[PDB]
Amino acid sequence: APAGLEVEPFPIQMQVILVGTPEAFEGLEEDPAFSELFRIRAEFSPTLP
Amino acid sequence: VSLIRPGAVHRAQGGYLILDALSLKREGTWEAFKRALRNGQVEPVTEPQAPAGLEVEPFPIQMQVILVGTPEAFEGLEEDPAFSELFRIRAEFSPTLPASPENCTALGGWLLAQGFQLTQGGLTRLYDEARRMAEQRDRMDARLVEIRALAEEAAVLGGGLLTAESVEQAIAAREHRSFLSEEEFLRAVQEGVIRLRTTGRAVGEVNSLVVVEAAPYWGRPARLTARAAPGRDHLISIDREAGLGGQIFHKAVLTLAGYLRSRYIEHGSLPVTISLAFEQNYVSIEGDSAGLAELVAALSAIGNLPLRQDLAVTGAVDQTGKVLAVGAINAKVEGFFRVCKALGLSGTQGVILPEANLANLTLRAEVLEAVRAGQFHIYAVETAEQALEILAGARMEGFRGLQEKIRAGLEAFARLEEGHDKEDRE
Amino acid sequence: GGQIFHKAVLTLAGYLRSRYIEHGSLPVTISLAFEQNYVSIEGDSAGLAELVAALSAIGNLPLRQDLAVTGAVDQTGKVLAVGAINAKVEGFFRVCKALGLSGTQGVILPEANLANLTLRAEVLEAVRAGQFHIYAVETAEQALEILAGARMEGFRGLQEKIRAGLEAFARLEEGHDKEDRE
Amino acid sequence: RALAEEAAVLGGGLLTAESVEQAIAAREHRSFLSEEEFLRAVQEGVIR
Amino acid sequence: MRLSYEALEWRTPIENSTEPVSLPPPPPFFGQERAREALELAIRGGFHAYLVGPPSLGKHEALLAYLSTQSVETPPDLLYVPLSERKVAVLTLPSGQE
Amino acid sequence: MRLSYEALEWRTPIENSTEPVSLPPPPPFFGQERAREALELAIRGGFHA
Numbered sequence: 001a002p003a004g005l006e007v008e009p010f011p012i013q014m015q016v017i018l019v020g021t022p023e024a025f026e027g028l029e030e031d032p033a034f035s036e037l038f039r040i041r042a043e044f045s046p047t048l049p
Numbered sequence: 050v051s052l053i054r055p056g057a058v059h060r061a062q063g064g065y066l067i068l069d070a071l072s073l074k075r076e077g078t079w080e081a082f083k084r085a086l087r088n089g090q091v092e093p094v095t096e097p098q099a100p101a102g103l104e105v106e107p108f109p110i111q112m113q114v115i116l117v118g119t120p121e122a123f124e125g126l127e128e129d130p131a132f133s134e135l136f137r138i139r140a141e142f143s144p145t146l147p148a149s150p151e152n153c154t155a156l157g158g159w160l161l162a163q164g165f166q167l168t169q170g171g172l173t174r175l176y177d178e179a180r181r182m183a184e185q186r187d188r189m190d191a192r193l194v195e196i197r198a199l200a201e202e203a204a205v206l207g208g209g210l211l212t213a214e215s216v217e218q219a220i221a222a223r224e225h226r227s228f229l230s231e232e233e234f235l236r237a238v239q240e241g242v243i244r245l246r247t248t249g250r251a252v253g254e255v256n257s258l259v260v261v262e263a264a265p266y267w268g269r270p271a272r273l274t275a276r277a278a279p280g281r282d283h284l285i286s287i288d289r290e291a292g293l294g295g296q297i298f299h300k301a302v303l304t305l306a307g308y309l310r311s312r313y314i315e316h317g318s319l320p321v322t323i324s325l326a327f328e329q330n331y332v333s334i335e336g337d338s339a340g341l342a343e344l345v346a347a348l349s350a351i352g353n354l355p356l357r358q359d360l361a362v363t364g365a366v367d368q369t370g371k372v373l374a375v376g377a378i379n380a381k382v383e384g385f386f387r388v389c390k391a392l393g394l395s396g397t398q399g400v401i402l403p404e405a406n407l408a409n410l411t412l413r414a415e416v417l418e419a420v421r422a423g424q425f426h427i428y429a430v431e432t433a434e435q436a437l438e439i440l441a442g443a444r445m446e447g448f449r450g451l452q453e454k455i456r457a458g459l460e461a462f463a464r465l466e467e468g469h470d471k472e473d474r475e
Numbered sequence: 476g477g478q479i480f481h482k483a484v485l486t487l488a489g490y491l492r493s494r495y496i497e498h499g500s501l502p503v504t505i506s507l508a509f510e511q512n513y514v515s516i517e518g519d520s521a522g523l524a525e526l527v528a529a530l531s532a533i534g535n536l537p538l539r540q541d542l543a544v545t546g547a548v549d550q551t552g553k554v555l556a557v558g559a560i561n562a563k564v565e566g567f568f569r570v571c572k573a574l575g576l577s578g579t580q581g582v583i584l585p586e587a588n589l590a591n592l593t594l595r596a597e598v599l600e601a602v603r604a605g606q607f608h609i610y611a612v613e614t615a616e617q618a619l620e621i622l623a624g625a626r627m628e629g630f631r632g633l634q635e636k637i638r639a640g641l642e643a644f645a646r647l648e649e650g651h652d653k654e655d656r657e
Numbered sequence: 658r659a660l661a662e663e664a665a666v667l668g669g670g671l672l673t674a675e676s677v678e679q680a681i682a683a684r685e686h687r688s689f690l691s692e693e694e695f696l697r698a699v700q701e702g703v704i705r
Numbered sequence: 706m707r708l709s710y711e712a713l714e715w716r717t718p719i720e721n722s723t724e725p726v727s728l729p730p731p732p733p734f735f736g737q738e739r740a741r742e743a744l745e746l747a748i749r750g751g752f753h754a755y756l757v758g759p760p761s762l763g764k765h766e767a768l769l770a771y772l773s774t775q776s777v778e779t780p781p782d783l784l785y786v787p788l789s790e791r792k793v794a795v796l797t798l799p800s801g802q803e
Numbered sequence: 804m805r806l807s808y809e810a811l812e813w814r815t816p817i818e819n820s821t822e823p824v825s826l827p828p829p830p831p832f833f834g835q836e837r838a839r840e841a842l843e844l845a846i847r848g849g850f851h852a
Contacts, residue, residue, distance in 0.1 A: 016851045017842075032119075032760040039198055040852035042841035043229040048834030050787040063780025065772055067765070070755070086753070105785065105793045113747060116755035117764050123757055135753050137659050140743035141690035142758025146736035153717075155731035162730040170722020177716045186715050187701065191737070194761035205848035213722040226841045240590040242556045254551065274551045278492035279499025287489070287550065291482040291519070324489035326550040330519070350493075374703045407708075408701040411715050421710040429708050462499070469500045472649050581805075589806075593813055603808035610805055666750035687743045 050103070058091055061112040070118035074125045086114065086135050145188035148180050152189060159193065160211075165200050167211030174216040175200060181411035184379055199223070217414075230264045231384070234331075235391040243329065245272055247392050250355035253277075255440075257342035258363040258381035258400070262333035266377060268384030270361055272328040275346035279462040279469070282310065282319035286343075287326040289336045301339035307368035308344065308433075309351075315456065316463040323347045338365040341372055341403070345437050351462075352455035356440040359395070360428060361385040364403040370433045374405040379412060386416045386425055394419065399426035401436045483521035487529060489550035490615070495641055502644040505529045520547035523554055523583070523612075527619050534637035538622045542610065543567040544583040552615040556587035561594060568598050568607055576601065581608035583618050660684065733771035741771075748775060 018025070018038060028034045057066055073079040085091035090107030116123075116136060126132045146152055156179070157172040167175070175196065176189060183190035190196070199219055200211060206222065207215025237243040245256060257273040260266060284306045289299050310319045325343050327334075341364035349356045363381050365373040375381075382400050389398040402410075407429055412420075419425040430436040437451060438444050445452045492501050507525050509516075523546040531538045545563050547555045557563075564582045571580035584592070589611055594602075601607035612618040620627055627634045660680055661672055667683070668676030698704045734741040740756065747754035756764050782803035786796040832839040845852035 015845065015849055017845070018852075036194065036761060038851045040841055040845040040848075040850045041226045042838040042845065042852050043226065044832075044835055044838050045229055045232065050785055050793050053785055053793075059783075062783050063777060067768065067772075103793050104791060106795050108785075108795055109783070109797075113751055114753045115744075115747070115768070117768065118755075118757065119760055120757045123755065136755045137663070138743050138747040138752050138754035139687050140740040140747070140754060140756045141688065142737060142740050142756060142762050142764060143690060143693070144759045144762075152736050154728055155735040157726060158728035158730045159735070161726075161728055166725055168722045168724060169726045170719045172726060173717050173719050173722075180715070185701065185703075188697070192759065192761045193763045193767075197763075201848060201850070202844065205844060210725075213719055222840070222844060225837065226844075229837060232837075242587050242590055244553075244587060274549055274553075276489050276493035276550055278489070278501075279496055280492070285485060285489070287482055287485045290480050290485065292476065292479050295480045322492070324485065324493070324550050326486060326489065328549050328551075328553065329555055371705070404706075405703055405705055407712075408703055410713060412713065414716065417710070417714060417716070420708075420713055427708045427713060429706055435706070462496075465496060465499055469498070472645060473652060475649060475652065592811060594811065596814070599808065599812060599814070602806075602811055608805050609811060662750060662752070663746065666746060666752075683742065683746060687739065687746075690739060693739075 053093055053103075053105070056093065058085075058108060058110060058112075064112055066112050066114045068114060068116050070116050070126055071122045073116075074122070079126060083129065083131055083135070085110065087131060142191065144191055145183050145185065146191045148176075148183075148185075148187045148189040156189070156196070160197075160200055163197055163200070165204055165211055166209060167200070168213065170213035171203070171207075171211035171216050174213045175203075175211070177411075178216065178220055181379065184377065184409050184411060186408055186411060227265060227267075230261070231267050231269065231387065234269055235388060238388060239391055245270055245388060246358035247389055247398055248395060249358055251358050252353055252355050253346055253350035254358065255342050255346040255349070255356055256358055256361045256385070257327075257340060258361050258385050259327075259332050259334070260377050260380055261331050263331050266380050268377065268380035268382065269331075270385050270388050271332045273340075273342050273346055274326050274328060275343065275350045276324045277321045277347070277350040277458075277462070278324065279320060279465040280322045282306065282322065284309070284323045285325070286334075287324065288330075288332060288334045294336075300337045301335065301343075304339040304366070304368050305344055305347065308339075308366070308370060309347065311368065312370070313455070313459055316459045318463075320463040320466045321351055321459065323350070335365075338373075338375075340364065341366045341401075341433055341436055344433050345440060348433075348437055348455060349440070352451065352458040354437075354441050354451060354454060357442065359397045360399045360401050360426075360440060362401045362436060362440065364401075364406075364430075364436070366433055372403040372405065372430060372432055372436070374403055374409065378402055378406040378409045382410070382427070383413055383416060386419065389425065394424045396424045397426075398424075399428055401428045401430055401439055404429045404431045482519050483517070483525070486521040486548065486550045487526055490526065490548065490552055491529065491533075493550070494552070495638065497638065498641045498645055502641060502648050503533060505532055517547075520555070520557070522546065522557075523548050523585070523615060523618055526552075526615050527622055530615075530619055530633075530637060531623070534633065534640040536619075536623050536633065536636060539624060541577075541579040542581040542583055542608070542622060544618060544622065546583070546585040546588070546612075546618075548615055554585040554587070554612055554614060554618065556585055556591070560584055560588040560591045564592070564594055564609070565598060568601065571607070576606050578606045579608070580606075581610060583610050583612055583621060586611040586613045733767050733774070737767075744768075744771065 016038070073082060088107065089110050091110060092105050092107045095102055153172065153176045156176055157167065160167055160172070160175070178199065179189040179196050180186060182192070182195065202222065203211050203216045203219035206218045234243065238245055246254065247256070253275050255273050256270045258268055259271045260268055284302055286299065286302050289302060309323070310317060325347065342362040344366050345356065345362055348354070363375060363378065365375050367373055382402065385400055416425060420427060428439050430439065434445060441451050443451055492499060507529065524544045526548050527538065527544055530536065545557060545560070547557050549555060564584065567582055568580070592609070598607060602609060610621055612621065616627055620633060623633050625631055625633060663683065664672050664676040664680035667679045743754065746752070756768065758764055779800040782798045782800055784796055784798070784803050785793050787793045841852065844850070
């Protein structure tokens with residue numbers, strides 16, 4: 001479409017909370033930017049006392 | 050002419066264009082950009098399916114281009130001789146800064162400029178934590194983004210003011226959030242699933258300290274074993290020969306073999322084959338830097354010396370016996386101290402690490418307070434002989450010393466092999 | 476990978492070579508094979524079954540078939556933990572019951588796995604009735620002496636019997652070398 | 658030519674001997690980081 | 706040898722933690738003299754240059770803070786001027802003339 | 804050594820199986836205090852976790 005509006009980018013004011021298996025985050029954790037953006041790691045212990 | 054949208058070049062005339070070499074190679078635009086810099090001119094991108102376009106005269110370039118990126122990202126560009134031909138000036142950001150009170154004041158000023166409110170104690174604690182993160186006492190980490198993030202976390206926990214106690218809370222929370230793997234390890238050790246001798250003597254068993262690479266940075270002990278058999282001089286490192294590792298002569302294996310052979314010459318054929326292995330896995334091995342733990346375990350196995358399981362052993366060893374520095378010493382020592390604490394401190398446990406790592410030792414305050422209490426003794430050694438003497442408790446001198454018992458063990462293996470060779474000739 | 480070293484093979488070889496130094500040039504080659512396949516091998520940990528079977532083959536030891544054995548072992552002889560002890564013990568108990576229990580069927584499992592034993596109600600009831608037995612061992616010596624039914628030292632000591640078997644292999648190789656003179 | 662340029666900037670309009678020395682020293686010093694780390698490690702005793 | 710506490714105690718002694726401290730902001734690239742001198746050389750001479758360093762060093766932040774403090778001669782205005790509907794040349798003018 | 808039934812008995816001793824239980828719902832992430840505290844930190848500070 002050559003009729004694209006010059007849409008102003010929508011500002012982001014939210015907390016992004018990724019969810020996934022430890023395997024899934026291994027690919028993303030490689031990136032030096034990922035550790036810079038997401039730096040609070042909430043781990044779910046697979047067992048409870 | 051009115052549809053020409055200015056790009057990066059069309060806004061930096063007489064100024065500075067700040068680029069990211071990582072992007073330049075990720076978008077493959079480095080070739081075109083380098084050609085443009087060569088020409089000193091550039092044209093906007095022309096769509097090849099629009100013959101009724103504009104033959105725009107190339108836009109002149111009069112600007113300082115200042116590339117930004119990591120040292121790793123620039124080798125992809127340093128192959129081109131034009132790259133060093135264009136950018137003659139390389140500014141290398143030192144990963145560490147001199148840890149001096151002037152730099153502490155500078156750090157405080159920088160944090161205040163970031164908008165944080167910090168007490169003097171909080172600044173001191175952040176400066177100490179930065180030094181620890183750099184893992185040297187006299188060089189504070191220059192990664193000011195990480196320091197800023199840590200200060201953010203401390204402010205959130207402190208209500209807005211970076212009091213010292215808030216900074217210790219933030220550091221403890223940082224450790225605690227990624228502590229799950231170590232929680233499982235300690236819980237297993239308590240439950241007996243992973244039995245690590247933290248008391249008493251054992252022959253050939255040592256408590257090495259390893260950094261798991263099946264996980265992020267976390268030092269933990271791994272019980273390393275070495276067994277001696279009478280036979281060839283071949284030295285098998287099981288963790289380094291679990292597959293496609295026996296066809297490669299690893300530098301660690303050759304280093305251990307060289308030290309062992311050249312240290313004892315009365316049976317210089319090395320009548321003993323040494324099998325080195327790790328109890329269980331989660332063990333990650335360098336495979337290129339022989340560990341002091343392996344050497345002391347092999348010597349104890351050869352000489353049948355009961356090594357103390359109280360004291361962990363870490364360090365990279367050279368064939369002369371000169372113990373070298375190892376990366377991430379703090380993590381290893383903290384991990385062993387945690388494992389000792391979970392099993393309860395008997396007041397005798399400790400760590401044997403190279404003297405070279407003395408300037409890398411920045412231990413967590415719990416370990417320091419344990420040390421001052423005479424409950425956890427950090428032993429620093431220079432050469433493998435000192436570490437072996439500390440483990441065995443005895444010296445290299447006198448009747449029935451460590452050297453004498455190692456000689457006796459090698460002699461016993463030599464005579465056993467001679468008797469075996471007698472069987473091969475009869 | 477018929478030309479690639481394995482952690483299990485190196486582990487067992489190290490243990491065997493170290494434990495019998497009066498024949499350090501280990502005179503006997505041992506073949507470890509699983510009767511029937513459907514056997515999925517870890518390939519990264521040498522099972523206590525492999526070690527005790529090798530020892531019985533060396534020493535001509537009649538091992539008890541009543542008891543199963545499981546567990547990984549280091550190159551020192553320390554019986555380590557293995558995953559899913561429950562499934563293995565339940566499987567052996569079912570196989571025993573289908574053939575009819577006799578009160579002597581049992582399992583040899585490492586004491587490390589004691590914090591994992593969550594056996595079913597039927598197995599626990601069989602234990603309480605003394606129909607199925609769980610023996611927890613820590614070092615390969617204990618498992619070997621349990622299976623063989625005799626102690627390592629003394630009359631018909633298992634260590635002495637293994638030494639006798641290795642000496643028999645050594646004298647056989649010497650007799651073969653007698654033909655190598657020609 | 659590049660080194661002469663660097664010397665000229667440090668002198669401002671002239672390639673004096675001092676300017677050439679300063680330019681060469683700066684050439685060494687800008688890529689001196691690895692050796693700086695090496696010497697710091699040697700002094701601190703990390704590498705003996 | 707058995708390390709004593711004093712040779713192991715590295716934490717800077719905390720004196721006061723009850724009062725806030727006000728400090729002047731440090732100059733950009735503080736304790737980073739190599740980068741400062743290299744950038745001064747690359748700026749006075751107008752040479753192309755490149756910064757290297759481990760990630761999360763705040764290279765962008767510190768670099769932009771330092772560059773904004775720099776004063777540069779007033780750049781000329783450069784603009785595309787169409788001599789036809791097919792030919793568009795580049796025109797340079799004194800500052801503020803476009 | 805032959806483990807006794809008492810040592811291997813791990814089932815919780817069942818007292819009553821005749822009356823319904825009335826218990827309040829547990830706090831979210833029960834027994835997951837690591838994840839709970841990490842999310843507390845991520846929420847109060849508004850970081851990306």
